Design a protein around this nucleic acid. Structure first.
Length: 178
DNA sequence: AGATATATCTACGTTTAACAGTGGCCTTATTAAATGACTTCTCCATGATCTAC
Protein backbone atom coordinates (compact mmCIF):
# COMPACT_ATOMS: atom_id res chain seq x y z
CA UNK A 1 0.00 0.00 0.00
CA UNK A 2 0.97 3.67 -0.17
CA UNK A 3 0.47 6.89 1.81
CA UNK A 4 -2.67 7.90 -0.11
CA UNK A 5 -4.39 4.79 1.24
CA UNK A 6 -2.94 4.93 4.77
CA UNK A 7 -2.04 8.41 5.97
CA UNK A 8 1.54 8.52 7.20
CA UNK A 9 2.58 5.33 5.41
CA UNK A 10 5.26 6.86 3.18
CA UNK A 11 8.33 4.86 2.18
CA UNK A 12 11.13 6.37 4.27
CA UNK A 13 13.89 5.09 1.97
CA UNK A 14 12.98 5.65 -1.68
CA UNK A 15 15.90 3.54 -2.92
CA UNK A 16 14.22 0.55 -1.22
CA UNK A 17 10.77 1.28 -2.65
CA UNK A 18 10.03 -2.26 -3.85
CA UNK A 19 10.79 -4.03 -0.56
CA UNK A 20 10.12 -1.59 2.31
CA UNK A 21 6.46 -0.95 1.49
CA UNK A 22 3.59 -1.38 3.94
CA UNK A 23 1.58 -4.54 3.30
CA UNK A 24 -1.98 -5.43 4.27
CA UNK A 25 -4.72 -7.97 3.65
CA UNK A 26 -7.28 -7.15 0.92
CA UNK A 27 -10.16 -6.42 3.31
CA UNK A 28 -8.08 -3.99 5.36
CA UNK A 29 -7.02 -2.48 2.03
CA UNK A 30 -10.70 -1.91 1.26
CA UNK A 31 -11.09 -0.27 4.67
CA UNK A 32 -8.12 1.98 3.83
CA UNK A 33 -9.95 2.76 0.59
CA UNK A 34 -13.09 3.83 2.44
CA UNK A 35 -11.48 5.72 5.34
CA UNK A 36 -11.92 9.23 3.79
CA UNK A 37 -15.72 9.26 4.16
CA UNK A 38 -15.74 9.12 7.96
CA UNK A 39 -13.04 11.68 8.73
CA UNK A 40 -13.97 15.36 8.57
CA UNK A 41 -11.66 18.19 7.54
CA UNK A 42 -11.05 21.54 9.21
CA UNK A 43 -8.99 24.62 8.41
CA UNK A 44 -6.50 25.97 10.95
CA UNK A 45 -5.75 29.68 11.39
CA UNK A 46 -2.52 30.81 13.04
CA UNK A 47 -3.38 33.47 15.67
CA UNK A 48 -0.01 35.17 15.16
CA UNK A 49 -0.61 35.37 11.40
CA UNK A 50 -3.12 37.99 10.32
CA UNK A 51 -5.84 36.13 8.45
CA UNK A 52 -6.06 39.03 5.99
CA UNK A 53 -2.38 38.61 5.09
CA UNK A 54 -2.53 34.79 5.10
CA UNK A 55 -5.37 32.67 3.76
CA UNK A 56 -5.73 29.38 5.66
CA UNK A 57 -4.04 26.35 4.15
CA UNK A 58 -3.29 24.02 7.08
CA UNK A 59 -5.67 21.05 7.09
CA UNK A 60 -6.72 19.24 10.27
CA UNK A 61 -8.07 15.71 9.79
CA UNK A 62 -10.29 14.48 12.63
CA UNK A 63 -10.37 10.68 12.82
CA UNK A 64 -12.70 9.29 15.51
CA UNK A 65 -12.19 6.15 17.55
CA UNK A 66 -14.90 3.65 16.62
CA UNK A 67 -17.08 2.05 19.30
CA UNK A 68 -20.11 1.17 17.15
CA UNK A 69 -20.97 1.47 13.47
CA UNK A 70 -24.41 3.02 14.02
CA UNK A 71 -23.17 5.50 16.63
CA UNK A 72 -20.40 6.69 14.32
CA UNK A 73 -22.78 6.92 11.35
CA UNK A 74 -25.30 8.97 13.32
CA UNK A 75 -22.53 11.20 14.68
CA UNK A 76 -21.09 11.87 11.22
CA UNK A 77 -24.52 12.59 9.75
CA UNK A 78 -25.24 14.98 12.64
CA UNK A 79 -21.91 16.77 12.16
CA UNK A 80 -22.86 17.19 8.50
CA UNK A 81 -25.33 19.89 9.64
CA UNK A 82 -22.68 22.37 10.81
CA UNK A 83 -21.72 25.50 8.89
CA UNK A 84 -18.35 25.82 7.15
CA UNK A 85 -17.52 28.89 9.25
CA UNK A 86 -17.57 26.62 12.31
CA UNK A 87 -15.00 24.31 10.72
CA UNK A 88 -12.44 27.12 10.63
CA UNK A 89 -10.76 26.75 14.03
CA UNK A 90 -7.69 28.11 15.81
CA UNK A 91 -6.52 24.91 17.54
CA UNK A 92 -6.48 21.16 17.04
CA UNK A 93 -8.47 20.67 20.24
CA UNK A 94 -11.09 23.10 18.93
CA UNK A 95 -11.61 20.94 15.83
CA UNK A 96 -11.74 17.79 17.95
CA UNK A 97 -14.35 19.31 20.25
CA UNK A 98 -16.33 20.52 17.23
CA UNK A 99 -16.38 16.94 15.94
CA UNK A 100 -18.06 15.98 19.24
CA UNK A 101 -20.07 19.19 19.72
CA UNK A 102 -23.29 17.77 18.24
CA UNK A 103 -23.17 14.52 20.23
CA UNK A 104 -26.18 13.94 22.46
CA UNK A 105 -25.57 14.14 26.21
CA UNK A 106 -27.19 11.47 28.38
CA UNK A 107 -26.90 11.82 32.18
CA UNK A 108 -27.47 8.12 32.91
CA UNK A 109 -24.84 7.03 30.35
CA UNK A 110 -21.19 7.76 31.12
CA UNK A 111 -20.19 9.65 27.98
CA UNK A 112 -16.64 9.15 26.72
CA UNK A 113 -15.41 9.70 23.16
CA UNK A 114 -11.91 9.65 21.67
CA UNK A 115 -10.65 10.96 18.34
CA UNK A 116 -7.37 11.72 16.58
CA UNK A 117 -6.49 15.04 14.96
CA UNK A 118 -3.97 14.86 12.11
CA UNK A 119 -2.38 18.17 11.10
CA UNK A 120 -1.27 18.58 7.48
CA UNK A 121 0.78 21.64 6.60
CA UNK A 122 3.18 22.73 3.88
CA UNK A 123 6.73 22.67 5.24
CA UNK A 124 7.70 25.84 3.37
CA UNK A 125 6.09 28.48 1.16
CA UNK A 126 6.88 26.58 -2.06
CA UNK A 127 6.01 23.11 -0.74
CA UNK A 128 4.31 21.08 -3.46
CA UNK A 129 2.30 18.90 -1.07
CA UNK A 130 1.31 18.88 2.59
CA UNK A 131 3.22 16.93 5.24
CA UNK A 132 1.94 15.43 8.49
CA UNK A 133 3.16 17.88 11.15
CA UNK A 134 1.17 16.88 14.25
CA UNK A 135 -1.01 14.08 15.61
CA UNK A 136 -2.78 14.63 18.93
CA UNK A 137 -5.24 12.46 20.87
CA UNK A 138 -8.40 13.99 22.36
CA UNK A 139 -10.40 12.16 25.03
CA UNK A 140 -13.63 14.00 25.86
CA UNK A 141 -15.69 13.15 28.93
CA UNK A 142 -19.02 14.59 30.09
CA UNK A 143 -17.57 17.47 32.12
CA UNK A 144 -15.23 18.66 29.37
CA UNK A 145 -17.98 18.63 26.74
CA UNK A 146 -20.55 20.48 28.88
CA UNK A 147 -17.90 23.05 29.79
CA UNK A 148 -17.13 23.47 26.09
CA UNK A 149 -20.83 24.00 25.33
CA UNK A 150 -20.97 26.56 28.14
CA UNK A 151 -17.97 28.37 26.63
CA UNK A 152 -19.58 28.27 23.18
CA UNK A 153 -22.78 29.74 24.61
CA UNK A 154 -21.19 32.56 26.62
CA UNK A 155 -18.31 33.42 24.29
CA UNK A 156 -18.96 34.98 20.89
CA UNK A 157 -18.82 33.02 17.64
CA UNK A 158 -16.56 33.66 14.65
CA UNK A 159 -16.98 36.87 12.70
CA UNK A 160 -17.55 35.89 9.10
CA UNK A 161 -15.69 38.81 7.56
CA UNK A 162 -16.52 38.89 3.86
CA UNK A 163 -14.43 40.82 1.36
CA UNK A 164 -13.56 40.65 -2.33
CA UNK A 165 -13.99 36.91 -2.64
CA UNK A 166 -12.59 36.91 0.89
CA UNK A 167 -14.80 35.25 3.48
CA UNK A 168 -12.42 35.58 6.42
CA UNK A 169 -13.41 34.02 9.73
CA UNK A 170 -12.61 35.65 13.07
CA UNK A 171 -12.03 32.94 15.68
CA UNK A 172 -12.16 33.82 19.37
CA UNK A 173 -8.77 32.85 20.80
CA UNK A 174 -10.16 32.61 24.32
CA UNK A 175 -12.52 29.81 23.41
CA UNK A 176 -9.58 27.83 22.09
CA UNK A 177 -7.46 28.69 25.11
CA UNK A 178 -10.16 27.40 27.43
C1' DA B 1 52.31 41.40 116.34
C1' DG B 2 47.87 39.27 115.84
C1' DA B 3 42.79 39.24 116.57
C1' DT B 4 38.66 41.91 117.52
C1' DA B 5 34.98 45.22 118.44
C1' DT B 6 33.84 49.74 117.34
C1' DA B 7 32.81 54.37 115.06
C1' DT B 8 31.73 57.00 111.48
C1' DC B 9 25.99 63.38 113.81
C1' DT B 10 21.92 65.92 109.87
C1' DA B 11 17.99 66.20 107.39
C1' DC B 12 13.89 67.19 105.09
C1' DG B 13 10.45 68.71 101.81
C1' DT B 14 11.90 67.73 96.70
C1' DT B 15 5.33 71.02 93.99
C1' DT B 16 0.84 71.24 94.82
C1' DA B 17 -3.65 72.61 89.60
C1' DA B 18 -5.50 73.07 84.93
C1' DC B 19 -4.92 72.53 79.94
C1' DA B 20 -1.51 68.96 75.86
C1' DG B 21 -5.39 73.28 69.92
C1' DT B 22 -9.39 75.29 68.82
C1' DG B 23 -11.06 75.79 61.67
C1' DG B 24 -10.85 75.17 56.78
C1' DC B 25 -8.79 72.82 52.61
C1' DC B 26 -5.89 67.20 51.35
C1' DT B 27 -5.21 69.71 43.84
C1' DT B 28 -7.31 72.32 40.45
C1' DA B 29 -6.28 71.11 33.29
C1' DT B 30 -4.50 67.74 29.92
C1' DT B 31 -2.24 64.41 27.32
C1' DA B 32 -3.39 57.76 28.48
C1' DA B 33 1.71 57.51 21.83
C1' DA B 34 2.96 59.01 17.89
C1' DT B 35 5.37 54.07 12.50
C1' DG B 36 6.89 50.38 10.08
C1' DA B 37 7.99 45.75 9.93
C1' DC B 38 4.13 39.87 11.96
C1' DT B 39 10.44 34.86 7.87
C1' DT B 40 13.82 34.52 5.49
C1' DC B 41 15.71 28.80 1.83
C1' DT B 42 15.69 23.63 1.54
C1' DC B 43 14.99 19.24 2.92
C1' DC B 44 8.56 16.15 -1.65
C1' DA B 45 6.45 11.03 -2.48
C1' DT B 46 5.69 7.77 -5.90
C1' DG B 47 5.56 5.62 -9.99
C1' DA B 48 6.87 5.37 -14.96
C1' DT B 49 10.81 5.04 -17.55
C1' DC B 50 15.87 4.70 -18.99
C1' DT B 51 19.67 1.99 -18.84
C1' DA B 52 23.55 -1.23 -17.52
C1' DC B 53 24.67 -6.06 -16.54
Amino acid sequence: ITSWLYLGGIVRHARTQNTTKLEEKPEYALALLFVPVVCHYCLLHIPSEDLKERKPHRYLVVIPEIKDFEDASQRRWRLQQLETKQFHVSSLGEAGLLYYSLDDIQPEVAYYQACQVWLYEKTNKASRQRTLMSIEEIKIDKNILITYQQVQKYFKTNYQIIKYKQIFIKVNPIRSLI
